[PDB]
Design a protein around this nucleic acid. Sequence first.
DNA 1: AGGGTTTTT
Length: 849
Amino acid sequence: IRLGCNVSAPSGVLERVKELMEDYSRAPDAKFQQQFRHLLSVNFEEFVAETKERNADLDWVNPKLDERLQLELGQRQLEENAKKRLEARKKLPTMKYADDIIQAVRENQVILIVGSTGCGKTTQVPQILLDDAISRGCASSCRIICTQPRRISAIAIAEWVSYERCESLGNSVGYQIRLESRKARERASITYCTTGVLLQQLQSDPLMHNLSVLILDEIHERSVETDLLMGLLKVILPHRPDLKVILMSATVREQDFCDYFNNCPMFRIEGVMFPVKMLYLEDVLSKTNYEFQKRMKHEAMIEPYLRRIRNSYDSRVLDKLRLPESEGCEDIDFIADLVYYICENEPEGAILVFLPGYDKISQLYNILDKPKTSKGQRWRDHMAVFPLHSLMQSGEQQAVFRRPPAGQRKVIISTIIAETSVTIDDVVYVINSGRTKATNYDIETNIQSLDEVWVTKANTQQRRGRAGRVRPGICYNLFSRAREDRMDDIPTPEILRSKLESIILSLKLLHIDDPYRFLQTLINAPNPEAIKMGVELLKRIEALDQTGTLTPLGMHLAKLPIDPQMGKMILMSALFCCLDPITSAAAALSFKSPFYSPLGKESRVDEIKRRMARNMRSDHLMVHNTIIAYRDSRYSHAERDFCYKNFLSSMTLQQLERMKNQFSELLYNYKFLASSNCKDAASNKNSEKIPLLRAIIGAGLYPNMAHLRKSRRAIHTMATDDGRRVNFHPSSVNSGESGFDSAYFVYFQRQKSTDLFLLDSTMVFPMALIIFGDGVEAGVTQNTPYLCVAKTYYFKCNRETADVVIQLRSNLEKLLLKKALYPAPIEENGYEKQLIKAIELLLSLDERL
DNA sequence: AGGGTTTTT
Ligand SMILES: [Mg+2]
């Protein structure tokens, strides 16, 4: 055992804390307390009974609305804005199956519609069922909900379906995504929403009584949400016989889903795309004649293959296949040469180049823009080159989607972002490197890594479709068909890679109290050891007790649309009057950073974040000052100038703001704040006290701690609480910085790519960890009295201070339990506030002189 | 000294 710095407090401070705690300790309507006890006392069958009675709206029908919409449909099918658009609808394949689909839905609770891009299932199926219900005189009974994995898709589909019915958004078709909705009319309607929206609505309507038809789309993507939803349908459907479910899938392991709901009927609907030619690396080198130079297990792979193709290819091209750099994207000039090849032959169209990540996108961009070969210099000013990356601004401009200047060919250098997330319509040629990046969590080492991996056959096939949009295209896969036969079918289902605390918590409100048994019923069951690891995190933050049952605090956390650790932080910031900065850190960790990382500008982006951090040594506070500065740029009509100069996405900033107001309104509605405004003065009287904000941040990210021991840019000898050597990620504001006031940091995410990095960190002080953490004891080890936290970091601390901080933790634990059970804003001149001031007092001792 | 991608009444 080593011993850290001294955290004993001056006697004058200790005795005012003693007086304050003693005033807290002379203290003597709860709707929330009844709801919480009611949830624990019900078994599942009485839970099912009660939800049925509380959600009964669709038990009511309006016959004059039934008959009036029945009439209006019949007449506007004689009209001529329809009767054009219905004969374009019937050119889509799905419409040929309308009647068989209507009948299969009537006879079966669950059906499955399998179709490729262009089949029209997503636009046409909901209309087929709705129009059928209106025609039969049943309009008011029908409420269709159709999920999508992505936000942009939900809106765009909804706007298109509304165009196909000659309606502005919001009468028969609507959408609903997080914090944005053009809601459809109540009945005889179709709504598109992100899968997560409907998961959040389950809390209020856990057996889906408020919809007559549920359609799940793109389930083949094996999103966490759709894998979760299908688990819950096996729980829900046996108590909802009148509910219809229509699963929808691409032709990607379609049979897994039909197997899963036990053999239910399955339609396969033809696609409409242009044919796209697949060439593998055999064919590319046979056509480009490129020449290379500047384990294996490659040749066990490549040589059996090279000889069932003896007579189909030249000798010299197959000698290139034996070089391990031939495949993938190890040689970027090879990729640059094939861009140059397509530019000369192979008539007009855009080139879409898939590379794994930021690093190789930068290389090929520099090669295409600062070419060193004569072939490239000819081509430099006849290409329009766009990098495409979630951290880059190109996606949020209109240029990459439009058609290039005359005489120039557009070339897009992109990550997997362009497979489904982003769609560009004039692409004719796909260069598929076959490599992307993926995050892999090892449960043994508790190390998450970001590694370069091969794509799956499902990826490769999606990328080939990206060329068949406007006209016949070509896909060049820079790997052999020997490499493809060693690719997996699909990527690892997202649920087996996910942290589970937040799912386990959400389930408790659906009265699914055993997560080991329930999660085992999913199409791919997560490892039970990951469930244990999720449950124990939840017991550590006291959302569950040691028998594993939900606690009043845990029920609050489960209703907040955010992972439970950062929920706890948001609630603490309500009780400790620092709401605005902490909701900002919370939103940024839940969603994204607002900073772009544009090519070539990495050194200038580093300086912008050091400037925005205001030397406060925290990536989290750094985000909040970004929001503060953003607000002032709108108050001054300098918004885009501000965003241009500092490489900020206004779109990410405005969303982060709507998340902060959504946390504020929720906390207000749960009776933890007096005002729903996250800028309210009463809610923010401590928002300028920096040592107090690092305490709240640590309360949320605990127990992810690290300790620094080195100097010199500077090099850092730092290790996390488990002993493993770490550094700050170079994107972090603490990367390379020297002269820290404290050697301790908390972090949200640790990750291995070249080294073991902390992606984000805030410098914390020992006394704040001790107050809000756990694993706290007082003792003596050498002849010195100590006070520890996590029984990992031990600090010199005299006994008079130790006895008070331990006493102070005890009262803070009793305060938190009661605020969770009997939520009320903490009154500004009451008993509870005296305890808060005691903690403020202790924490202020670490302020900068 | 480095950043695959979604998403939450
Ligand atoms: Mg519902």
